[PDB]
Scaffold this motif. Sequence first.
Motif, PDB file in Angstrom:
ATOM      1  N   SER A  92       0.809  -1.223   0.000  1.00  0.00           N
ATOM      2  CA  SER A  92       0.000   0.000   0.000  1.00  0.00           C
ATOM      3  C   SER A  92       0.846   1.280   0.000  1.00  0.00           C
ATOM      4  O   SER A  92       0.328   2.370  -0.235  1.00  0.00           O
ATOM      5  N   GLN A  93       2.148   1.141   0.242  1.00  0.00           N
ATOM      6  CA  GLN A  93       3.074   2.267   0.134  1.00  0.00           C
ATOM      7  C   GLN A  93       3.412   2.588  -1.321  1.00  0.00           C
ATOM      8  O   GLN A  93       3.873   3.693  -1.619  1.00  0.00           O
ATOM      9  N   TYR A  94       3.169   1.635  -2.223  1.00  0.00           N
ATOM     10  CA  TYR A  94       3.586   1.765  -3.620  1.00  0.00           C
ATOM     11  C   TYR A  94       2.464   1.796  -4.664  1.00  0.00           C
ATOM     12  O   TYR A  94       2.626   2.434  -5.703  1.00  0.00           O
ATOM     13  N   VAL A  95       1.345   1.115  -4.417  1.00  0.00           N
ATOM     14  CA  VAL A  95       0.278   1.042  -5.426  1.00  0.00           C
ATOM     15  C   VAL A  95      -1.032   1.664  -4.956  1.00  0.00           C
ATOM     16  O   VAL A  95      -1.338   1.668  -3.763  1.00  0.00           O
ATOM     17  N   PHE A  96      -1.794   2.177  -5.918  1.00  0.00           N
ATOM     18  CA  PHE A  96      -3.116   2.761  -5.672  1.00  0.00           C
ATOM     19  C   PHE A  96      -3.069   3.959  -4.723  1.00  0.00           C
ATOM     20  O   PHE A  96      -4.049   4.253  -4.039  1.00  0.00           O
ATOM     21  N   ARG A  97      -1.936   4.658  -4.707  1.00  0.00           N
ATOM     22  CA  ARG A  97      -1.736   5.807  -3.819  1.00  0.00           C
ATOM     23  C   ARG A  97      -2.719   6.949  -4.105  1.00  0.00           C
ATOM     24  O   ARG A  97      -3.085   7.697  -3.199  1.00  0.00           O
ATOM     25  N   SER A  98      -3.156   7.061  -5.359  1.00  0.00           N
ATOM     26  CA  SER A  98      -4.108   8.095  -5.771  1.00  0.00           C
ATOM     27  C   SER A  98      -5.564   7.806  -5.383  1.00  0.00           C
ATOM     28  O   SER A  98      -6.430   8.650  -5.605  1.00  0.00           O
ATOM     29  N   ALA A  99      -5.840   6.626  -4.825  1.00  0.00           N
ATOM     30  CA  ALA A  99      -7.176   6.314  -4.304  1.00  0.00           C
ATOM     31  C   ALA A  99      -7.612   7.381  -3.308  1.00  0.00           C
ATOM     32  O   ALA A  99      -6.807   7.840  -2.499  1.00  0.00           O
ATOM     33  N   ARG A 100      -8.880   7.776  -3.372  1.00  0.00           N
ATOM     34  CA  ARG A 100      -9.419   8.754  -2.427  1.00  0.00           C
ATOM     35  C   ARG A 100      -9.437   8.218  -0.992  1.00  0.00           C
ATOM     36  O   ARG A 100      -9.232   8.979  -0.048  1.00  0.00           O
ATOM     37  N   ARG A 101      -9.675   6.918  -0.822  1.00  0.00           N
ATOM     38  CA  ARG A 101      -9.559   6.285   0.498  1.00  0.00           C
ATOM     39  C   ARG A 101      -9.022   4.869   0.378  1.00  0.00           C
ATOM     40  O   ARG A 101      -9.135   4.240  -0.676  1.00  0.00           O
ATOM     41  N   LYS A 102      -8.443   4.392   1.474  1.00  0.00           N
ATOM     42  CA  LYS A 102      -7.901   3.050   1.569  1.00  0.00           C
ATOM     43  C   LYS A 102      -8.581   2.292   2.692  1.00  0.00           C
ATOM     44  O   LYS A 102      -8.555   2.727   3.849  1.00  0.00           O
ATOM     45  N   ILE A 103      -9.166   1.150   2.349  1.00  0.00           N
ATOM     46  CA  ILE A 103      -9.776   0.261   3.322  1.00  0.00           C
ATOM     47  C   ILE A 103      -8.882  -0.955   3.507  1.00  0.00           C
ATOM     48  O   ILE A 103      -8.458  -1.578   2.528  1.00  0.00           O
ATOM     49  N   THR A 104      -8.573  -1.278   4.757  1.00  0.00           N
ATOM     50  CA  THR A 104      -7.899  -2.528   5.065  1.00  0.00           C
ATOM     51  C   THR A 104      -8.979  -3.563   5.329  1.00  0.00           C
ATOM     52  O   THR A 104      -9.812  -3.383   6.212  1.00  0.00           O
ATOM     53  N   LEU A 105      -8.962  -4.643   4.557  1.00  0.00           N
ATOM     54  CA  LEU A 105      -9.935  -5.715   4.730  1.00  0.00           C
ATOM     55  C   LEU A 105      -9.751  -6.338   6.108  1.00  0.00           C
ATOM     56  O   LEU A 105      -8.643  -6.333   6.637  1.00  0.00           O
ATOM     57  N   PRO A 106     -10.833  -6.869   6.700  1.00  0.00           N
ATOM     58  CA  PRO A 106     -10.753  -7.458   8.038  1.00  0.00           C
ATOM     59  C   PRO A 106     -10.305  -8.925   8.027  1.00  0.00           C
ATOM     60  O   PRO A 106     -10.841  -9.750   8.766  1.00  0.00           O
ATOM     61  N   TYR A 107      -9.332  -9.234   7.174  1.00  0.00           N
ATOM     62  CA  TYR A 107      -8.688 -10.535   7.153  1.00  0.00           C
ATOM     63  C   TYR A 107      -7.414 -10.440   6.336  1.00  0.00           C
ATOM     64  O   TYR A 107      -7.254  -9.535   5.513  1.00  0.00           O
ATOM     65  N   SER A 108      -6.513 -11.379   6.582  1.00  0.00           N
ATOM     66  CA  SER A 108      -5.355 -11.575   5.730  1.00  0.00           C
ATOM     67  C   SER A 108      -5.774 -12.342   4.479  1.00  0.00           C
ATOM     68  O   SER A 108      -6.925 -12.766   4.354  1.00  0.00           O
ATOM     69  N   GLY A 109      -4.833 -12.537   3.564  1.00  0.00           N
ATOM     70  CA  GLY A 109      -5.136 -13.169   2.290  1.00  0.00           C
ATOM     71  C   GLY A 109      -4.976 -14.676   2.246  1.00  0.00           C
ATOM     72  O   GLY A 109      -5.179 -15.287   1.199  1.00  0.00           O
ATOM     73  N   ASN A 110      -4.613 -15.305   3.354  1.00  0.00           N
ATOM     74  CA  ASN A 110      -4.400 -16.740   3.283  1.00  0.00           C
ATOM     75  C   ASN A 110      -5.719 -17.492   3.226  1.00  0.00           C
ATOM     76  O   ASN A 110      -6.747 -17.028   3.733  1.00  0.00           O
ATOM     77  N   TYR A 111      -5.676 -18.652   2.587  1.00  0.00           N
ATOM     78  CA  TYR A 111      -6.875 -19.425   2.331  1.00  0.00           C
ATOM     79  C   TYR A 111      -7.692 -19.695   3.590  1.00  0.00           C
ATOM     80  O   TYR A 111      -8.917 -19.594   3.568  1.00  0.00           O
ATOM     81  N   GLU A 112      -7.020 -20.029   4.686  1.00  0.00           N
ATOM     82  CA  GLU A 112      -7.732 -20.367   5.915  1.00  0.00           C
ATOM     83  C   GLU A 112      -8.558 -19.186   6.423  1.00  0.00           C
ATOM     84  O   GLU A 112      -9.738 -19.343   6.738  1.00  0.00           O
ATOM     85  N   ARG A 113      -7.951 -18.006   6.476  1.00  0.00           N
ATOM     86  CA  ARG A 113      -8.652 -16.809   6.946  1.00  0.00           C
ATOM     87  C   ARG A 113      -9.781 -16.366   6.028  1.00  0.00           C
ATOM     88  O   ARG A 113     -10.827 -15.926   6.497  1.00  0.00           O
ATOM     89  N   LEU A 114      -9.558 -16.469   4.723  1.00  0.00           N
ATOM     90  CA  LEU A 114     -10.584 -16.118   3.746  1.00  0.00           C
ATOM     91  C   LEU A 114     -11.799 -17.032   3.833  1.00  0.00           C
ATOM     92  O   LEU A 114     -12.934 -16.565   3.752  1.00  0.00           O
ATOM     93  N   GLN A 115     -11.543 -18.329   3.976  1.00  0.00           N
ATOM     94  CA  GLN A 115     -12.597 -19.332   4.127  1.00  0.00           C
ATOM     95  C   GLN A 115     -13.421 -19.102   5.397  1.00  0.00           C
ATOM     96  O   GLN A 115     -14.644 -19.262   5.381  1.00  0.00           O
ATOM     97  N   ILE A 116     -12.747 -18.724   6.484  1.00  0.00           N
ATOM     98  CA  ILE A 116     -13.423 -18.346   7.732  1.00  0.00           C
ATOM     99  C   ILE A 116     -14.345 -17.137   7.502  1.00  0.00           C
ATOM    100  O   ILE A 116     -15.513 -17.160   7.886  1.00  0.00           O
TER     101      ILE A 116
END
Length: 246
Positions: A92-116
């Motif tokens: 997030s320090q390098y991409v989509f910096r011009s976005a008006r806002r940044k939302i951090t999703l309430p999970y990591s990207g690993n399969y186990e957390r996403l499935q939960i």
Amino acid sequence: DVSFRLSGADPSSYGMFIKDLRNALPHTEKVYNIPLLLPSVSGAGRYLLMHLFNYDGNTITVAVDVTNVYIMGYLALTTSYFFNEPAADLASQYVFRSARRKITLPYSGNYERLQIAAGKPREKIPIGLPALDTAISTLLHYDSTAAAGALLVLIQTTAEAARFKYIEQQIQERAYRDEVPSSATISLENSWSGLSKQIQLAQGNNGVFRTPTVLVDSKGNRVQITNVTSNVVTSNIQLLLNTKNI
Ligand SMILES: *[C@@H]1O[C@H](CO)[C@@H](O)[C@H](O)[C@H]1NC(C)=O
């Protein structure tokens, strides 16, 4: 950057996108004729942008770490979204910096957390090109539970397909009808790190794995991969996770 349009998509155009995706990942070396992903890349060059368009022509841009093919986050109109994990916050320090806002999703990207978060294992989530169209549509407007399922579809129809020719083919079979992934598909996804490692360890071990990798084949039959002559190595796997990242 690479692009894929669901409007008019067919197995051929999807194949071209997965080829573009693989070709966008840098490598300095092949190991048993398979590109070896880099140990690291500094700055913005670490991230590939995938422009994905749903059937109606609406678009998201997905940021992919080129060292491991991990999705870090995505841009939907003027809002960026990133996984709740340090690698994604770094991205997030390098991409989509011009976005008006940044939302951090309430999970990591690993399969186990996403499935939960999604409320179901991905054995139960149909994948295919129609599912990808739906996923893109879902991600356009924030809904974290819906997005978890969408992201499970997105990861499998993009990065997983890039990693394994078998998975690319499974998605091509699902060009106009979704179907839950084969048990073999799941097995390969789960085994990518292990396989990447054992293929690299085989280099100074006469093509022999230091530790065998157990997979499920097309018929639902469980089998052992012990060396580089296996079809998984000679035909299927297309990218190797660098052992320095394992
Ligand atoms: C290596 O794997 C091949 C392919 O599955 C198998 O037929 C063979 O028994 C194995 N050979 C060695 C030397 O491990």
